[PDB]
Write an enzyme that holds these catalytic residues in place. Structure first.
Site, mmCIF file in Angstrom:
data_model
loop_
_atom_site.group_PDB
_atom_site.id
_atom_site.type_symbol
_atom_site.label_atom_id
_atom_site.label_comp_id
_atom_site.label_asym_id
_atom_site.label_seq_id
_atom_site.Cartn_x
_atom_site.Cartn_y
_atom_site.Cartn_z
ATOM 1 N N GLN A 1 0.944 -1.391 -0.079
ATOM 2 C CA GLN A 1 -0.068 -0.042 0.046
ATOM 3 C C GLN A 1 0.938 1.359 0.188
ATOM 4 O O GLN A 1 1.618 1.485 0.686
ATOM 5 C CB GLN A 1 -0.964 -0.085 1.197
ATOM 6 N N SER B 1 3.631 -6.671 3.622
ATOM 7 C CA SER B 1 2.267 -6.691 3.734
ATOM 8 C C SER B 1 1.549 -7.346 2.599
ATOM 9 O O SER B 1 1.420 -8.535 2.407
ATOM 10 C CB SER B 1 1.564 -5.456 4.444
ATOM 11 N N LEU B 2 0.743 -6.308 1.880
ATOM 12 C CA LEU B 2 0.097 -6.911 0.642
ATOM 13 C C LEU B 2 1.067 -7.618 -0.241
ATOM 14 O O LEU B 2 0.785 -8.654 -0.877
ATOM 15 C CB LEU B 2 -0.522 -5.681 -0.200
ATOM 16 N N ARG C 1 -9.434 -8.798 1.936
ATOM 17 C CA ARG C 1 -8.539 -8.440 3.059
ATOM 18 C C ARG C 1 -8.703 -6.898 3.351
ATOM 19 O O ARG C 1 -8.915 -6.476 4.429
ATOM 20 C CB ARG C 1 -7.217 -8.786 2.813
ATOM 21 N N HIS D 1 -2.114 -3.828 11.446
ATOM 22 C CA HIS D 1 -0.820 -4.842 11.958
ATOM 23 C C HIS D 1 -0.711 -4.785 13.441
ATOM 24 O O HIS D 1 0.463 -4.895 13.905
ATOM 25 C CB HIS D 1 0.285 -4.559 11.057
ATOM 26 N N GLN E 1 -0.353 -12.431 10.147
ATOM 27 C CA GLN E 1 0.229 -11.302 9.753
ATOM 28 C C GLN E 1 -0.721 -9.870 9.796
ATOM 29 O O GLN E 1 -0.326 -8.995 10.171
ATOM 30 C CB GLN E 1 0.375 -11.253 7.822
HETATM 31 CL CL CL Z 1 -2.253 4.908 0.083
HETATM 32 CL CL CL Z 2 -1.788 -3.876 3.470
HETATM 33 CL CL CL Z 3 -0.742 1.993 5.366
#
Ligand code: CL
Ligand code: CL
Ligand code: CL
Ligand code: 8JZ
Ligand code: CL
Ligand code: CL
Ligand code: CL
Ligand code: CL
Ligand code: CL
Ligand code: CL
Lengths: 306, 307
Positions: free
Chosen positions: B11, B92-93, B117, B201, B250
């Site tokens: 992101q 993350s992603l 998600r 998170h 996660q």
């Molecule tokens: Cl963003």
């Molecule tokens: Cl994310």
């Molecule tokens: Cl973020």
């Protein structure tokens, strides 16, 4: 000329922007070096490496974008490419346009937009302002929704970006009430935008008053190429009125769809977006279906438009 | 090339117009976005190329957009016959992008998964109740201490360890604001409030993670064809049920990116190549182990650096 050049604002920045162009044209790193001299830090290094959280803080994003657009402009001029008929830019982008038109000295503009970012961040206590994107609703219905939602507080349209793409802002609860009313009026979506600064509404007026004090200390000259302002959609030539337009721009809506329409009304057939990303280019053909729109911010894109 | 790893961004790395150049040249780019669009029920490529940027920036759209972008580049990399990396990882992603490229998750199923998600993340806590800050210049243990001091019974924790001296914290808004002040008092160079509604998170995502688990139970995961180092445990997991579990944990646990990069170096990797829009991860590598900074791959010209 049958083309115009437009400059993007906040959100268009990206880590790594202009790398390709810098490899080929020394004027890119020279422009960033000038900016760094007045900022007191290495702006090129921030743009190429991050941290992105720092690049995204408005008081750094503004000079980063201003330097980026001016660097591309300088490459255009170095190649002796034809001059655009008119310039305009979205919020911060207006400053980029004014520098390219010879109204504001670049170094002075860099400090000015850094200050503009600082004043905007310090304007209202964080969490007290909000911004929402309203999609698929006519301007008149949105204005009405804001008027009904206000109830003594600030809530107004702050960006007219394309038909069916309007941003509203103001006091958090008022903006939230307006979102509900816009939905009840038929809006397709009402998106809360992750932002602390309710830009371009009456809450920024005290910050504008402070910005006015700084504009009194900088020399502005008459534009060399017409610049259509966001606040009035006018190609103003009187430097004191240009300063007034910047002051009012801060607390007034950005009339971007009208700016684009004005360009078309004059005979412009193509808008070249000079800066990172292609945000404004996405709006161009939504506003006037017959306009062509292209972004120039790397060697490939520069080569295709020459 | 020297032994290398490929890393995938998350992101923030999205941009209107991304991959335009590459899509003009190689059919598989738009083919990949078309597969995503089939799953999503809207034209993802059109969103990425034209906006609205405000829609692209909503996490449940950003996530599939980035997954599609990275996988598209991976398919071009394979088409051109470029060398196999030794290991993959992502932020993350980005972990989902790595898992698709490693053959663990089917691309179309992954697109659905990351859309969901994003939706679950947005719904986790009411907007305005959470916050996030980037803290610069403090060691991990000092940040942990500031968060404990700030808590006052609420959730506030480090949520990303991005490089030594670059840590993101999140949780309950007031608690996070107290933590920012405490970090400055402890000697942080900068404490930046981030324009983000979702306190990702941290423990506030436990309920969302529980719901994501229900969907993971319906998607087939296979053993990876290329090792993938996970964010939650910094482990190259090979058991697909454990990979699923790592994805669920996660969501409410910190992203241990610093360690992920160090673990790659431990496995003999000499360079990390970032594969997706932008150069965000390329800059973090520099701040973790300077010599692992590798070429960035996301447009036509850059494919030459890896040929
Ligand atoms: Cl963003
Ligand atoms: Cl994310
Ligand atoms: Cl973020
Ligand atoms: C010529 C590059 C493709 C060789 O395949 C590998 C490194 O797995
Ligand atoms: Cl931004
Ligand atoms: Cl940020
Ligand atoms: Cl701005
Ligand atoms: Cl939506
Ligand atoms: Cl374009
Ligand atoms: Cl296309």
């Amino acid at each position: 000329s049958k083309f115009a050049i437009v400059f993007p604002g906040q959100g268009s920045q990206a880590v790594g922007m202009l790398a390709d162009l810098a490899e080929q044209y020394a004027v890119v790193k020279q422009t960033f070096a000038e900016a760094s001299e007045v900022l007191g830090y290495d702006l090129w290094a921030l743009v190429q490496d991050g941290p992105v959280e720092d690049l995204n803080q408005t008081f750094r994003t503004q000079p980063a974008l201003l330097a980026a657009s001016v660097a591309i402009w300088r490459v255009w001029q170095q190649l002796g490419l034809e001059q655009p008929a008119v310039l305009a830019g979205h919020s911060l982008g207006e400053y980029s346009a004014l520098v390219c038109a010879g109204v504001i000295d670049f170094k002075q503009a860099i400090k000015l937009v850094e200050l503009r970012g600082q004043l905007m961040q310090q304007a209202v206590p964080a969490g007290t302002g909000a911004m929402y994107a309203i999609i698929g609703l006519e301007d008149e219905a949105i204005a009405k929704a804001c008027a009904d939602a206000a109830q003594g507080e600030v809530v107004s349209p702050v960006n007219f970006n394309s038909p069916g793409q309007v941003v509203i802002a103001g006091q958090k609860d008022a903006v939230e009430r307006a979102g509900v009313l816009c939905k009840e009026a038929g809006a397709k979506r009402a998106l809360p935008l992750p932002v602390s600064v309710p830009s371009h509404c009456a809450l920024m007026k005290p910050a504008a008053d402070e910005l006015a004090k700084t504009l009194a200390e900088l020399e502005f000259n008459a534009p060399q190429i017409p610049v259509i302002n966001n606040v009035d959609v006018v190609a103003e030539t009187d430097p004191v009125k240009i300063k007034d337009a910047l002051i009012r721009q801060l607390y007034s809506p950005v009339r971007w769809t009208e700016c684009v329409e004005q360009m078309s009304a004059q005979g412009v057939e193509k808008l070249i977006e000079m800066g990172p990303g292609k945000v404004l280019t996405g709006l161009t053909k939504r506003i006037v279906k017959t306009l062509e729109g292209v972004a120039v911010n790397d060697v490939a894109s520069l080569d295709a438009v020459k």
